[PDB]
Amino acid sequence: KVFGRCELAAAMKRHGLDNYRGYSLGNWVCAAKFESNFNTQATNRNTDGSTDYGILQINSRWWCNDGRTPGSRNLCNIPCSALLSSDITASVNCAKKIVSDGNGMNAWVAWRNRCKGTDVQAWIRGCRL
Numbered sequence: 001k002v003f004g005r006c007e008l009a010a011a012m013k014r015h016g017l018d019n020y021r022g023y024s025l026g027n028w029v030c031a032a033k034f035e036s037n038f039n040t041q042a043t044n045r046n047t048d049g050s051t052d053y054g055i056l057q058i059n060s061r062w063w064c065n066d067g068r069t070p071g072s073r074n075l076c077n078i079p080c081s082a083l084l085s086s087d088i089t090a091s092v093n094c095a096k097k098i099v100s101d102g103n104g105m106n107a108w109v110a111w112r113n114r115c116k117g118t119d120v121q122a123w124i125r126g127c128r129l
Helices: 005-014 025-036 080-084 089-099 109-114 120-124
Strands: 043-045 051-053
Touching: 005 025, 005 120, 025 109, 025 120, 051 080, 080 089
Parallel strands: none
Antiparallel strands: 043 051
């Protein structure tokens, strides 16, 4: 599923991401834009053999099981396929664990490089929340 901007903002809010660990909704929408272009089915293979999955490009090295990342963990206790669903519940739950892990949203490289310190409220402007 490819979400629209305001449609994703609403879905994230419903699932309790707005202001989670102090990050406003705009940060989450911004990170989703540049990680996946709002596509729940997005996947990307890394040079180390791990794969990033879903709307927030959650990585198999630590967070989910895909059966093909040797020596990896599955700290969200889910198959990586669950992160590709049209329903974003699994991705949001895992993102909450990730952002609590110590480095905040810096865990998302695209957020650090393209969202951090910018006018992220622009991403929720005009949206009926």
